Ligand SMILES: CCCCNS(=O)(=O)c1ccccc1
Ligand SMILES: CCCCNS(=O)(=O)c1ccccc1
């Protein structure tokens with residue numbers, strides 16, 4: 743949703759978006775809420791984000807973020823900002839994979855809400 | 862094991878853990894191996910998982926799973942996530958009891974790696 747997201751990402755994620763929303767019972771409404779900063783800790787959205795990340799190998803089976811793959815997918819414009827916020831927010835911590843991603847999202851959104859995006 | 866697993870279960874299983882590891886020649890390394898995502902189809906671990914399940918009355922003599930009790934014993938957030946996964950992955954199928962549980966474990970891990978834990 744933020745204006746920096748490369749156009750190609752909308753097509754790149756389309757397959758795994760459909761699959762992940764089906765698996766987690768996610769609605770588009772929940773997703774639209776996130777750029778508005780209305781994220782709540784509900785598995786239907788938190789496990790969706792986990793699902794989408796895992797699909798691009800941005801996280802492992804334990805929801806640990808691969809910083810290199812994350813920076814790789816991000817555009818050049820955001821490398822500086824994203825590296826700083828990852829330093830701050832990683833490694834992930836939480837009770838389960840979905841909570842780990844919720845905790846990461848909240849962490850990022852505290853200083854850099856426009857760096858965390860969901861589609 | 863994942864961070865969500867109830868503290869109580871470490872003590873609750875200690876008796877049957879010992880008996881089940883002894884029965885199936887299981888080593889602690891094999892058990893630890895699973896958390897890492899490295900579950901293999903080997904009877905010393907797959908029959909161990911059967912054995913622990915049966916101890917909690919979660920499987921019968923044919924490795925049919927009691928979905929209701931399995932789900933009921935999971936903490937709230939894991940119970941929600943597992944309902945879907947268990948809908949897909951149950952009832953069990955396979956050539957023997959040990960393979961049935963291997964197939965269940967892999968099935969669960971495809972969508973919900975952190976849901977299927979072994980101790
Ligand atoms: C780092 C930005 C947060 C990623 N959130 S997301 O899980 O919806 C997602 C969006 C796009 C690709 C993969 C995952
Ligand atoms: C007695 C209370 C502990 C059971 N909780 S459990 O999540 O570890 C669990 C173990 C085995 C199957 C399902 C859930």
Ligand SMILES: CCCCNS(=O)(=O)c1ccccc1
Pocket residue numbers: 874909910911913914917976977978979980
């Ligand atoms: C979601 C259920 C996981 C079952 N895994 S287990 O069979 O090794 C087991 C762990 C603890 C108690 C009984 C069985």
